[PDB]
Design a protein around this ligand. Structure first.
Ligand SMILES: O=C(O)/C=C/c1cccc(C(=O)Nc2ccc(Cl)cc2)c1
Ligand SMILES: O=C(O)/C=C/c1cccc(C(=O)Nc2ccc(Cl)cc2)c1
Length: 292
């Protein structure tokens, strides 16, 4: 299968398999080629994503099942947000660029959610950027096909840092709200240059959330005490003000972030409603300086 395009390089190691940069011999385009390591139901679910096209979604070019191995062919972008924020650590990112990126990501979410497709595993590593100021969501719809594993194929730990509390509390039904939660965590990280909730176990993840947002109860989250993994013995932390959490973000940004991090997934702001928030009144599309 690797003889029907040149393998420019191994790009790195994704959740499910190796990622290569490759040239498509027929089209001449440079693409990302992801080998998925281990299922007809999955092939059908993923093949449907070839029509889920939007400028803020990494394009799924092809789905190849051969010699019992699965390969996904995607649009290539040169950098991810993790590497960009690491490279930006001494200075931070301009607020206009943070705002542009959040706005664009919300447009991608609004599109996919309107088609009833979730991501479920948003994280900086699957947010790809180009020279023109665009940002795009990678690997949309793959969790519904493959699951979100504990470890990758290389045994690397799959991050918990962006996981919504309903998932951690054992809800089996995911709503689009899980993606808004993850994006809110990413927003906070862009602003502060630190992960919001860098848990290193499921309980550390849930208790970090609680120590910032307060331990949830039936006042803020009806039904929370009946969730599978809820325990009455959870410690009861008081909620922190967002002014201490994400300084120096303004009150428009803090209001939006608070709505993206509501405990109750039914209450959590939708992507479509978020696009109308006053924080985006002055949105623009700045150029990032990328060194490729
Ligand atoms: O404010 C803070 O920084 C901490 C306050 C705080 C207060 C009470 C309990 C805990 C806590 O999480 N304990 C714990 C012990 C065993 C396991 Cl298995 C999980 C959790 C923490
Ligand atoms: O205009 C330029 O050429 C670059 C300016 C520039 C460069 C780096 C960082 C910043 C900055 O202040 N970022 C920031 C982030 C979050 C909040 Cl909440 C407020 C501010 C600005």
């Amino acid at each position: 299968f690797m003889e029907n395009f040149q393998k420019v390089e191994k790009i790195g190691e994704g959740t499910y398999g190796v990622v290569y940069k490759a040239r498509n011999k027929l089209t001449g385009e440079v693409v990302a080629l992801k080998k998925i390591r281990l299922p007809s139901t999955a092939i059908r679910e993923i093949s449907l994503l070839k029509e889920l096209n939007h400028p803020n979604i990494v394009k799924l070019l092809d789905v190849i099942h051969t010699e019992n191995k699965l390969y996904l062919v995607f649009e290539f972008l040169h950098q991810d947000l993790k590497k960009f924020m690491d490279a930006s650590a001494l200075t931070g990112i301009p607020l206009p660029l943070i705002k542009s990126y959040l706005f664009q990501l919300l447009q991608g979410l609004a599109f996919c959610h309107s088609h009833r497709v979730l991501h479920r595993d948003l994280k900086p590593q699957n947010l790809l950027i180009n020279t023109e100021g665009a940002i795009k969501l990678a690997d949309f719809g793959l969790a519904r096909a493959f699951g979100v594993p504990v470890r990758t194929y290389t045994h690397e730990v799959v991050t918990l840092w962006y996981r919504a509390p309903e998932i951690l509390l054992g809800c089996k039904y995911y709503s689009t709200a899980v993606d808004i939660w993850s994006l809110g965590c990413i927003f906070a990280e862009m602003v502060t240059r630190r992960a919001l909730f860098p848990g290193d176990s499921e309980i550390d993840q849930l208790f970090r959330i609680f120590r910032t947002l307060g331990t949830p109860d039936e006042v803020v989250w009806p039904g929370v005490t009946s969730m599978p993994d809820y325990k009455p013995s959870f410690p009861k932390w008081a909620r922190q003000d967002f002014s201490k959490v994400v300084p120096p973000l303004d009150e428009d940004g803090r209001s939006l972030l608070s709505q993206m991090l509501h405990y109750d997934p039914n209450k959590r702001i939708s992507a479509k409603a978020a696009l109308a928030h006053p924080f985006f009144q002055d949105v623009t599309k700045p150029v990032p300086h990328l060194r490729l």
